[PDB]
């Protein structure tokens, strides 16, 4: 039914860490870490490290952006940062060890992969979420057609919501679930971009991919 | 040099096995610094605070039905599972002891007072070692270091006999251990 | 009447920011996960040829542990741990014999927190080549054990000693050894 980021997810366990509130590192925080890598010889790998920390952040928020409707997403998001925090422990005591900085980078990747697995696992165990997430794609695809010749002036970010209320504002799921209605509101901005000839859409998110894929 | 206060958090999951895996008991405990606060005893079926500081945790976890069922099944999915994984090189691990006998002086002034029976590099730690003076078992004058675990999956122990070996006598150190069907022996002619 | 015990023990210590994930069987270490490299290391190579473990899982656990340590420290109103000095002892692997390869074992027992500096000395000179050590092993009283090793060639002209430094000690503890 719904495509997972990992087809056959390996068992995942929750540590009940969804209620943490400040897992994400601030810039000053990250900078104070980058600063430890003060030696010359390590300045090249320090770039690859900063680049990975960024890819990391984008990855994490990417998950909440696509799956905020899935209860277990806070668990996955928070775990990612709790793990990052451990890697940073090593980074702080190995600030100029290029081989270590490279291992850490490799681990930051592994942490992301694990996140995708675990996410796929929790999704597989929540058939209901799947039905809802698929239905959201279903209607966004219909909306892709429905708005074929209409005027979409989304400049003030007001029309999108109206259109969703106009075409599906009576759908039980669009009234009751904010996340579901949002996937559709998010969808019309995508459709708009599609019409303007945007070609990267499918790479924008799992949702965008599921929507604009055939 | 470092005079800063430290704070320690430990978590231990103990699997206790009896008669193979007939009876298993899981003990999950949380330790702050040097004091257990909360724990899950499979014999109980749910979290119980051990100190005041544990209460919040015992209360919170216990309200998670999914979590409790897991822990309750852990005895099988975790304990018995892991027990199998390593059985061949742990429970079955057998390393024959190396027995040798050499004299020694109880004091720098004393004569060749005691004989030492060195039993080393064996595993499991369960072993038996007895002294015999001309076929007759000796007990009254034995002293030992007790069983010693080396930390590399092997044990060693020293068993001494406090007797000035008179000429003519043949002392014998007999070692019995799982790694060998017939007891090991080392004689020492007076 | 219990026959065996398999213990999964992990810890996180502040402000050092040092953690440990290990499996224990009847007192001996089966393996542990090197936190820095995030990978399983077995106590005996042989073990790896028959079993495995996802180091990534340990990372997850130590990640949560860290967060818990903060929560507990605060909830306890920042109560620091009471240093308990180690009991050091040194003996050989097997009976010593001139020029016959042997090993020196330094047993550091009953202590906490899990932080300790160990140094091997031969006639006053710090020795290294050959040395090894086990990670921090857990005790039922919630204190720790640790072993350090020094392979050596016996000789009637060497005096070795294991130097152990721990916060619970007034001065560096220095246990001697020299065939005696």
């Amino acid at each position: 039914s719904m495509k997972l980021r990992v087809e056959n997810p390996k068992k995942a366990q929750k540590h009940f860490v969804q209620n943490l509130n400040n897992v994400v590192f601030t810039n000053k925080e990250l900078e104070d870490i980058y600063n430890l890598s003060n030696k010359e010889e390590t300045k090249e790998v320090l770039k690859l490290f900063k680049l990975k920390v960024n890819q990391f952040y984008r990855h994490a928020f990417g998950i909440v952006n696509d799956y905020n409707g899935l209860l277990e997403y806070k668990e996955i998001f928070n775990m990612m940062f709790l793990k990052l925090s451990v890697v940073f422990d090593t980074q702080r005591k190995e600030a100029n060890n290029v081989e270590q900085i490279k291992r850490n980078i490799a681990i930051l990747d592994e942490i992301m992969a694990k996140a995708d697995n675990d996410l796929s696992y929790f999704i597989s165990q929540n058939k209901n979420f799947q039905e809802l997430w698929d239905k959201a794609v279903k209607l966004t695809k219909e909306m892709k057609i429905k708005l074929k010749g209409q005027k979409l002036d989304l400049r003030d970010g007001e029309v999108a919501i109206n259109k969703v209320r106009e075409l599906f504002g009576s759908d039980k799921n669009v009234k009751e679930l904010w996340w579901f209605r949002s996937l559709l509101v998010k969808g019309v901005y995508l459709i708009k971009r599609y019409y303007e000839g945007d070609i990267e859409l499918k790479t924008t998110s799992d949702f965008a991919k599921a929507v604009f894929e055939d | 040099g470092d005079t800063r206060p430290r704070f320690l958090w430990q978590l231990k999951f103990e699997c206790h096995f009896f008669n193979g895996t007939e009876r298993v008991r899981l003990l999950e405990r949380c330790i702050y610094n040097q004091e257990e606060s909360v724990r899950f005893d499979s014999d109980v079926g749910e979290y119980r605070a051990v100190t005041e500081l544990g209460r919040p945790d015992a209360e919170y976890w216990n309200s998670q039905k999914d979590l409790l069922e897991q822990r309750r099944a852990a005895v099988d999915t975790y304990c018995r599972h892991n027990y199998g994984v390593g059985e061949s090189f742990t429970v079955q691990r057998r390393v024959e002891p190396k027995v040798t006998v050499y004299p020694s002086k109880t004091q720098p002034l004393q004569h060749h007072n005691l004989l030492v029976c060195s039993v080393s590099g064996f595993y499991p730690g369960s072993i038996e070692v007895r002294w015999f003076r001309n076929g007759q078992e000796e007990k009254a004058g034995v002293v030992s270091t007790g069983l010693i675990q080396n930390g590399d999956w092997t044990f060693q122990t020293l068993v001494m006999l406090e007797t000035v070996p008179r000429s003519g006598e043949v002392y014998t150190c007999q070692v019995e251990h799982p790694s060998v069907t017939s007891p090991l022996t080392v004689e020492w002619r007076a | 009447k219990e026959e065996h015990v398999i213990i999964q023990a992990e810890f996180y210590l502040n402000p050092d920011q040092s953690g440990e994930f290990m499996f224990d069987f009847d007192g001996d270490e089966i393996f542990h996960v090197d936190m820095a490299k995030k990978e399983t290391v077995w106590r005996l190579e042989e073990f790896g040829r028959f079993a495995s473990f996802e180091a990534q899982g340990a990372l997850a656990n130590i990640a949560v542990d860290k967060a818990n340590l903060e929560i507990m420290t605060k909830r306890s109103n920042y109560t620091p741990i009471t240093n308990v000095p180690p009991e050091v002892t040194v003996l050989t692997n097997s009976p010593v014999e001139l020029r016959e390869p042997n090993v020196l074992i330094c047993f550091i027992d009953k202590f906490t927190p899990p932080v300790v500096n160990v140094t091997w000395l031969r006639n006053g000179k710090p020795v290294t080549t050959g040395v090894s050590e086990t990670v921090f092993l857990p005790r039922e009283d919630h204190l720790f054990r640790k072993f350090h090793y020094l392979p050596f060639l016996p000789s009637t002209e060497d005096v070795y000693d294991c130097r152990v430094e721990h916060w619970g000690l007034d001065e560096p503890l220095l246990k001697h050894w020299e065939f005696d």
Binding site: H15, L20 | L11, Y60, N82 | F31, F50, A60, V64
Partner: peptide
Amino acid sequence: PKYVKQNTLKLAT
């Protein structure tokens, strides 16, 4: 054979 672990749970709040 794969050694399996027990997940750590986050403390109260």
